[PDB]
Nucleic acid binder design. Structure first.
Ligand SMILES: [Cl-]
Length: 892
RNA sequence: GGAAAUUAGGUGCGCUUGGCGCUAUAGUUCCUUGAAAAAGUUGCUAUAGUAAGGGCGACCCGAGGCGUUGGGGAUCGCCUAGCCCGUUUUUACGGGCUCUCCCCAU
DNA sequence: TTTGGAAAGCCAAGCGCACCTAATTTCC
DNA sequence: TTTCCAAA
């Protein structure tokens, strides 16, 4: 009952092997699969929703004020007022308001318009992009041409003669926030000179306060919550790198670890030399190894350990190149401290440097910085948090230090650094200073080992988190079947930049109980190179190769690697784990394992071992979450219905993105109402070689009736057909579908029917109730009634079994096409992982267990059998006998 | 393999802003089709919508991940969960306890 | 029905933290 | 990657 576990872990799969190294037999093998980054669309959607909401609120706050300050009676009045007929362009009104009184209506439009877009405001703390160049250029245009305001620039300047708003993803019209504030103030001023009653200084101040309001990049404890904890004191936060304690610790560690070598040997610096290097670092901006040699007058027989001196030993060049210490944060803060006069007694102390470091590292807005440095910061639970100096600093200082930017933390808390530094000051190495302070420098886990792996610390990297948690489920399933392993051999694929390898090794080593044995490393990391050589040499050379690799990994120890090097040394003047190992591996990876094992000489497996023997069945992780993108993003117009009941949609499309045929024709909506534009585009496309980028890299004009040049043509509406759309914005647009949540399967008079359920259906009161009819519009799909029996719901990667009726077979297609005369396999029946449904055809798509074959467009209506199964972690599956059609109810 | 530091990078997660794109409507503009009624096209500007939908004014949630169980999953719960006890490994170690629902298994 | 495949919202300008790599050092 | 269209 002792075994070796082999594990092959990627970001999308865990191959595994149970091997008995004494019996010299493969016990059991398998594969668990779990197929931008995952959170990015969600994060971006979050940002978009907030931006739009905050803009709307700003306009709403302004409209509420306009009532209260007496520009209108109420909001109902205000809306009607402004939704009267606009005569003059609001940009022209913005310019007119500089030299004449604006009417109430004109003024209201101007104030709303100014609040739509607030311009660029840098948050930079440390090449210039297209936004910065345009902001700078626009600022220069206004300064040099004497434009009184942004609007005056935008109306009068040649740069904006064709458009004011930005087009085709350029940033020509982006201006500074400050220039728009100048405009607001100017217009309130000029309106007051021209006797506008609604331009009072009170109104001005409330307008600017509303217009200017914005949230800081971080508020309160937000940064503190992201900062990690001390390696030694895990309820402490990590210290800022800008703190004195961090910088002095780092300095002392560095100097104490210097080593110098001559022909005789290697030595450290003495206490006298250290003091000299330490004092130089505290006064000089940067220190090189050259400055270290110079301050100590160190003989040219000595070299510093760790430098590359090459052949020539051009010592000044090598040593001058290498900066050993640069206490930037210290010197920057020390300069600001020296601008601030102190009383005769007191001096700037370590706690002042730490306090300012904390303030600027843990907080980014001026309100939090100010409160903290005034010693009255309240955290997000209203609890006072005094600064480290317990000091209310002066407004002068707070103002001055807020010009600095600090960031980043070390691994250790301030408390830990306070205890360690005194021992580093006595010249100890880092490790011994830690010991002297009362800390185990390795922070070794004191925790008790466990029979199954405990839950994993949830980490923010969703791909790494999935891999580790799936690998845990595999290991724990295998422990619960076979008991504890003697060792675990692990290989990883490089897909997480080393995070999975480092995490997983340490986690298993620290937490898992191994079966009692003499073997030293409980966790053995094998190289892909060695694995790859053995597979080639053994001629063992899809999802099954992960299982193969898990076998090789399991039987790869260091003692076996020696036998390969012994062989290659001997051959210079091939090792197998056991007899028939190749043939056994091939047997265990095959569909007919029993037949292949029994074909080996001399009852290679016992009668028991053969009775237990199943073919490998790859286990695929279920995906049964009902959240997801609700529908596609772009809004479309419905312009008609096809004969077969599809929606005809249209959407404005840039000339470069239009789809043209051989003749340069395209599906332009309203072609009949614009032959000049239709013909101009087609003609332009044909002039060039159907090179769309070349053709549409210059302006195209619509010809006027007289034949001279009229307006530019940048896009037209293109028509396309779609069965299923959803209305948005009170039916003012439609949108297409995104991923299907689940497919509900029904039976009626021995035929099968499919009802796709979309994310938009989760908001409804009732489930959708129409099963697909191929090539017909939604109106002609069939309403479900008592004649249909509900069978089950299929999510992606649910397991199905189908049997085709006798008149035909299912054509499985090889995922990887080959030199074979046959790249398809036709089967009467199949167990397969469901992928989805084609709503135009009621035909499905699936993959066989290991992903090596698939089918697509398989109609279900006249199958002989259609059943649902479910798979466990290790590959066993179980028939679903009965399901209820579940309602769908998000908490949102 | 493990701790800390440095230099140069990488991946991910979170946040604040800016500007578009698309849709709808109004004006203006290029007009086109149509006997007419009408319908619609090009450019510019404005105003509105921009997950679907839900909860209470620098309002909030809403496309991600994980937990579970006899074995699995979630629309449930959580996102660095909660709540106790033991212990001088008291910033640690140990041991208790725990929502609703669906499928499978005995 | 099966097969082949087009389309899908996007970029600029920053503020942060976590984890990981390569090289270098002192250490268990 | 996924929906689902039009071609085969
Ligand atoms: Cl532009």
């Amino acid at each position: 009952m002792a075994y070796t576990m082999g594990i092959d872990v990627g970001i999308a799969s865990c191959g595994w092997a149970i091997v008995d190294l004494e019996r010299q037999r493969i016990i059991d093998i398998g594969v668990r699969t779990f197929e931008e980054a995952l959170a990015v669309p969600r994060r971006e959607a979050r940002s978009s929703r907030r931006r739009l909401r905050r803009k709307k609120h700003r306009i709403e706050r302004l409209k509420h004020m306009f009532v209260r300050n007496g520009l209108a009676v109420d909001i109902q009045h205000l809306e009607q007022t402004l939704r009267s007929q606009n005569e003059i362009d609001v940009w022209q009104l913005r310019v007119d308001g500089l030299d004449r009184m604006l009417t109430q209506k004109e003024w209201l439009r101007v104030l709303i318009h100014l609040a739509q877009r607030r311009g660029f405001q840098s948050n930079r703390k440390t090449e210039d992009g297209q936004v910065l160049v345009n902001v700078t250029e626009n600022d220069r245009l206004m300064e040099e041409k004497d434009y009184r305001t942004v609007a005056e620039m935008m109306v009068k300047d040649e740069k904006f003669s064709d458009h004011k708003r930005n087009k085709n993803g350029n940033y020509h019209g982006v201006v500074s926030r400050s220039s728009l504030l100048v405009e607001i103030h100017t217009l309130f001023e000029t309106q007051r000179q021209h006797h506008n009653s609604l331009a009072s200084k009170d109104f001005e101040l409330e307008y600017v306060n509303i217009w200017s309001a914005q949230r800081p990049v971080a508020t309160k404890d937000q940064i503190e919550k992201m900062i990690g904890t001390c390696t030694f004191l895990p309820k402490e936060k990590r210290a800022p790198k800008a703190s004195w304690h961090f910088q002095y610790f780092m300095l002392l560690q560095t100097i104490n670890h210097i080593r110098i070598t001559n022909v005789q040997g290697t030595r450290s610096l003495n206490k006298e030399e250290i003091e000299q290097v330490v004092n130089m670092a505290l006064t000089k901006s940067k220190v090189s190894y050259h400055d270290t040699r110079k301050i100590l007058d160190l003989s040219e027989e000595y070299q510093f350990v760790g430098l590359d001196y090459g052949k020539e030993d051009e010592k000044k060049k090598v040593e001058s190149k290498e900066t050993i210490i640069k206490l930037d944060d210290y010197h920057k803060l020390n300069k600001i401290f020296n601008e601030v006069e102190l009383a005769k007694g007191e001096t700037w102390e370590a706690d002042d440097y730490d306090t300012v470091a904390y303030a600027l590292t843990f907080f980014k807005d001026d309100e939090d910085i100010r409160d903290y440095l005034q010693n009255k910061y309240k955290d997000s639970k209203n609890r006072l948090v005094k600064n480290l100096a317990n000091k209310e600093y002066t407004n002068e200082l707070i103002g001055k230090v807020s010009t600095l930017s600090f960031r980043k933390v070390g691994h250790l808390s301030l408390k830990a650094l306070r205890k360690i530094i005194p021992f580093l000051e006595q010249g100890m190495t880092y490790d011994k200073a830690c010991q002297a302070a009362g800390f185990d420098f390795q922070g070794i886990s004191k925790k008790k080992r466990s029979v199954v792996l405990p839950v994993i610390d949830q980490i923010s990297n969703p791909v790494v988190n999935r891999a580790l948690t799936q690998t845990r489920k595999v290991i724990n399933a295998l422990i619960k079947k076979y008991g504890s392993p003697e060792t675990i051999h692990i290989e990883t694929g490089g897909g997480s930049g080393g995070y999975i390898t480092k995490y997983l090794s340490h986690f298993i080593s620290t937490n898992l109980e191994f079966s009692p044995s003499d073997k030293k490393k409980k966790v053995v990391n094998t190289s892909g190179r060695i694995t790859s050589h053995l597979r080639s040499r053994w001629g063992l050379e899809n999802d099954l190769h992960h299982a193969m690799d898990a076998i090789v990994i399991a039987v790869t120890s260091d003692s076996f690697i020696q036998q390969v090097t012994n062989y290659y040394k001997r051959k210079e003047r091939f090792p197998l784990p056991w007899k028939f190992f190749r043939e056994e591996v091939i047997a265990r990876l095959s569909p007919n394992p029993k037949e292949q094992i029994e074909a080996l000489p001399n009852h290679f497996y016992s009668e028991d071992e053969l009775a237990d023997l199943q073919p490998i069945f790859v286990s695929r992780m279920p995906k049964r979450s009902i959240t997801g993108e609700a529908h596609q993003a772009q809004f479309r117009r419905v312009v008609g219905k096809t004969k077969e009941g599809k929606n005809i949609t249209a959407k404005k499309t840039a000339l470069v993105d239009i789809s043209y045929d051989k003749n340069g024709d395209f599906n332009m909506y309203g072609r009949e109402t614009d032959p000049a534009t239709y013909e101009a585009i087609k003609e332009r496309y044909l002039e060039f070689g159907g090179n769309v980028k070349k053709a549409f890299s210059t302006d195209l004009h619509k010809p006027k009736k007289d034949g001279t040049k009229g307006p530019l043509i940048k896009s037209v509406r293109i028509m396309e057909n779609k069965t299923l759309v959803h209305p948005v914005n009170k039916g003012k647009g439609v949108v297409y579908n995104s991923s299907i949540v689940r497919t509900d399967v029904f039976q009626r008079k021995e035929k099968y029917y499919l009802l796709p359920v979309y994310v938009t259906d989760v908001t409804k009161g009732k489930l959708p109730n129409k099963v697909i009819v191929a090539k017909k519009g939604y109106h002609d799909w069939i309403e479900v009634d008592d004649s249909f029996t509900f069978l089950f719901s299929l999510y992606p990667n649910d397991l199905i079994f189908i049997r085709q009726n006798p008149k035909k077979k299912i054509s499985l297609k090889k995922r990887i096409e080959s030199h074979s005369i046959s790249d398809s396999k036709e089967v009467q029946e199949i167990h397969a992982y469901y992928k989805g449904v084609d709503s135009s055809t009621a035909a499905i798509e699936f993959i066989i267990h290991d992903g090596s074959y698939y089918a697509k467009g398989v109609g279900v209506q006249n199958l002989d059998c259609f059943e649902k199964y479910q798979v466990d972690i290790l590959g066993n599956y179980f028939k679903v006998k009965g399901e209820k059609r579940l309602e769908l109810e998000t908490s949102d």
